[model samples]
Target: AEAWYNLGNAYYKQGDYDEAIEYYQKALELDPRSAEAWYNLGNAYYKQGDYDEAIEYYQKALELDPRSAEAWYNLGNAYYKQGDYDEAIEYYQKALELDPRSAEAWYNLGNAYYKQGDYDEAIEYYQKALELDPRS
Candidate 1:
């Protein structure tokens, strides 16, 4: 069941949102409490431009595991796409608190801050991300 969820995540990362959602749904059916499955499903929905559904699944994932840094980070992304910079920033902060060395989360935090016109904070987060993962 976890393997299925991971496969879904791989597909999602590859930009195959529809296929990712399909596999994630299968994983959910097999284990409904899977926070990773819900989180990945939310990411697929977000990639497909279904912000409302994305938010729904993200919230569900967070409900299952509030301490999941990845879930919080992706939730921030969903909020960012919806133009909810304040909410995005809050979630990104939560993610950073959970996993301070998350380069992707920091990169996204920079993006959110940039969108909010906070160049200094954005630059700081961006630098942090680069420090953590120079490729990003």
Candidate 2:
């Protein structure tokens, strides 16, 4: 299963998301409980610009591993890319709550807020991100 997962990663890195999904599905078949496989599958879809498909895969990953801040963060990104600022904000909030040190989550939440015309809140989140990492 892990071997299949690794193959998926290789294909994903090579920009062959279609091949990646096939290997990831193989991994999932061997280990249906693997949150990693679901998460990677979501990533493959995400890289292919299929936000809805990414959302479904990320949702499954989160269902299996509720503590995964990365999954929540990526889920937010999928929504963000789809122009659903409301859903993006909700998911990013969950990601930040789960991992306070996530600068990317904070930055993306700020972006969502800006999209929603909440400039003050957006600035605050932007400040938070800078506080976490000045270079960010």
Candidate 3:
């Protein structure tokens, strides 16, 4: 079960989204409830620019693991890519709730608010992001 997931991850890091997706799907076959596998599959789809498909797998990942801030963040990313700022914000907030220390989330939330014409909110999030990683 875990081996299949690892293979999927290997393929993913190797920049082969197709093979990664296939391995992740195979992992799902043996461990249908693996949130990590589902999340990685979503990531593969995301890398392939299939935002809609990524959202589907991300939602499935979240259903099994509500505590996954990474999944929530990716969902926000997919929604953001699709120009769904409101939905992206919702997921970003969820991600922040689960992992308040996420500078990337803060940065993306800032971007979302900026896109939504909420400059003040955007600045606030951006400040948080910068403060968390001053060197970044």
Candidate 4:
């Protein structure tokens, strides 16, 4: 399973998302309980602009490993790409709960709020993001 997963990663690094997805699927078939495999599969779909498929796989990854901050953060990104600000905010908040130092998540949350016409909330989150990383 790890070998298949590594092949998927190699393909992903090469920007061959289709091949990555195939290898990830093989990895999952060998070990359905692998949260990392599910998360990587979700990322491959995300790179292919398949936000719905990414969301489903990310959800599955979260089900297997509830504390996976990266999965939650990427789930937020999937929702954000779909223009679902509410769901995106929910998932980003979950990610923040697990990893408060995520400047990317904070910045994304700020953007989500800005998209919803909530400048005040956006500024607050943006400030949090900046505080975490001054250069950002």
Candidate 5:
């Protein structure tokens, strides 16, 4: 199950959402409470432009593990896609609370803030992201 979950993450990172979803489902079947699997599955759905489904899976992941920074970050991304900037910020803040060093989360939060015309907050978050990971 863990191997399948890891493979799903690799596939997801490579932009192979279908393969990622397949592997994630296998992992979920083996370990229903696997919050990471649910979170990755949400990412796959989001990449496929299924924002509602992505939200559903993300919520499930959060239910399993409320403190999962990645899950909250990804959930924020889904909200951003849906043009719900306030909700996005909420989730991103939750992610930051759990993992302040998450460069990706900071970068995404910056994007969301920028979209909402909060340039100062955007720049601050972007700087934080860069400070955590210069390549970002």
Candidate 6:
């Protein structure tokens, strides 16, 4: 069980998202409530440009682990990729509520605003992200 999880992680780190999906699927089959497996599956789908699939998996992940800021952040990314900036903003705000220090969440929030042509809001969120990780 853990082997499948570890292998999925290894493949993910290697950027072999399709392969990672197979391993993550196996892990999830063995443990349906595995938030990590669900989240990783979402990431794999996202990498494959399957935003809808990624959103589904990310939603499942959040259902299993409501407090996961990473899942929320990723869900936002999936929505953003699908040209749903308003929904992305909602999920990004949820992610920020869970982890206010997450520079990536702030950065993505900035992106969503930027897509809406809200220059001031985008700049505000971008500056927030920069303050969290200036080097980023």
Best by TM-score: 4
Give per-residue lDDT, candidate 2, residue 136: 48
- Candidate 4 — which pairs collide? none
Q: Candidate 5 at 89: error in angstroms? A: 0.7
Every candidate's lDDT = 0.90, 0.94, 0.95, 0.96, 0.92, 0.93
Candidate 3, residues 1-136: lDDT per residue as tens digits? 7999999999999899999998899889989888888899999999999999999999999999999999999999999999999999999999999999988899999999999999999999999999998777
Model 4's alpha-carbon lDDT is 0.96
TM-score of each: 0.79, 0.96, 0.95, 0.98, 0.79, 0.93
Residue range 1-136, candidate 4, lDDT tens digits:
9999999999999999999999999989988989989999999999999999999999999999999989999999999999999999999999999999988889999999999999999999999999999894
The runs of at least 3 residues in candidate 1 whose Cα sits more than 4 Å from the true structure, single-residue gaps closed, are 1-15, 26-30, 134-136
| lDDT, candidate 2, 1-136, per-residue tens | 9999999999999899999999999999999999989999999999999999999999999999999999999999999999999999999999999999977779999999999999999999999999998884
In angstroms, the error of model 5 at 25 is 3.7
Higher-ranked by TM-score: 1 or 5: 1
- Of candidates 6 and 1, the better by TM-score: 6
| lDDT score at residue 60, model 6, on the 0-100 scale | 96
Better of 1 and 3 by TM-score: 3
Question: Superposing every Cα of model 6 onto the true structure, what RMSD results?
Answer: 1.3
Worst 10 residues of 2 by lDDT: 96-105
Model 3 lDDT vs. the true structure? 0.95
* lDDT against true structure, model 6: 0.93
Question: Which ranges in model 3 have alpha carbons more than 4 Å from their true place?
Answer: none
Best by lDDT: 4
Task: Kindly indicate the candidate among 4 and 6 with the higher TM-score.
Answer: 4
Q: RMSD to the native, candidate 3? A: 1.0
> What is the C-alpha lDDT profile of model 6 across 7-125, one tens digit per residue?
99999998999999999999988988788889999999999999999999999999999999899999998999899999999999999998999887899899999999999999999
